[PDB]
């Protein structure tokens, strides 16, 4: 079950009952970016926003209209435009933008409005009956990158720390820590022993093979 806007730049496909993956395309050459949309008994929760405030505002309206609920919280995985691009849209709509303190300060060094900076290395959030765990595995794609784990589904949102199956390029490594990236993916693997689905920053949902694939690219 996939829902798109009239343009094709935004789509939301269901992963399962209350877990959907939202994907937006940003021009530059159109690049897709993934994130999660969690349907809970107490509102919609998202993992990452979109490239900018226009797309982010449109993504929000799309999901709010569909589920007839308001987006209450959003988890920013790192301080790049594809995740925190619509930070200005979240704050004026009373949406809580959760992030580690580091992501918060890097958001300001990069010119984005500041997120909450509330997430610790390990933080467990529960929205209604939806359990979420955010984890900072260390430096990799960026200095502040975190992953999100849904224990009830064993679904991992590796985000930009994980590359999709056909990606042969690590992407932007100007702000990355290539050498540590590998140790950080290892911490994710050591922490979650029974991974089912793995959602990469860009690309189709895969499994733990995507983390092994990314470690291969890092070699
Ligand atoms: Zn990035």
From Swiss-Prot:
Pfam families: Lactamase_B. The keyword Signal applies. It is an enzyme of class 3 (hydrolase). Keywords: Antibiotic resistance, Hydrolase, Metal-binding, Periplasm, Signal, Zinc. Substrate binds at residues 163, 172. SMART domains: Lactamase_B. It comes from the Bacteria. Its EC number is 3.5.2.6. It is found in: Periplasm. It catalyses: a beta-lactam + H2O = a substituted beta-amino acid. Disulfide bonds: none annotated. Inhibited by captopril stereoisomers and iodoacetate. Also inhibited by chelating agents such as EDTA. One of its GO terms (cellular component) is periplasmic space. GO terms for biological process: antibiotic catabolic process; response to antibiotic. Zn(2+) 1 binds at residues 78, 80, 141. SUPFAM superfamilies: Metallo-hydrolase/oxidoreductase (SSF56281). Binds 2 Zn(2+) ions per subunit. The enzyme can also function with only 1 Zn(2+) ion. Its cofactor is Zn(2+). Zn(2+) 2 binds at residues 82, 160, 202. InterPro entries: BcII-like_MBL-B1, Beta-lactamase_class-B_CS, Metallo-B-lactamas, NDM-1-like, RibonucZ/Hydroxyglut_hydro. Belongs to the metallo-beta-lactamase superfamily. Class-B beta-lactamase family. Monomer. Confers resistance to the different beta-lactams antibiotics (penicillin, cephalosporin and carbapenem) via the hydrolysis of the beta-lactam ring. Active on cephalosporin and penicillin. This is Metallo-beta-lactamase type 2. It comes from Bacillus cereus. The lineage of its organism: Bacteria, Bacillati, Bacillota, Bacilli, Bacillales. The gene is blm.
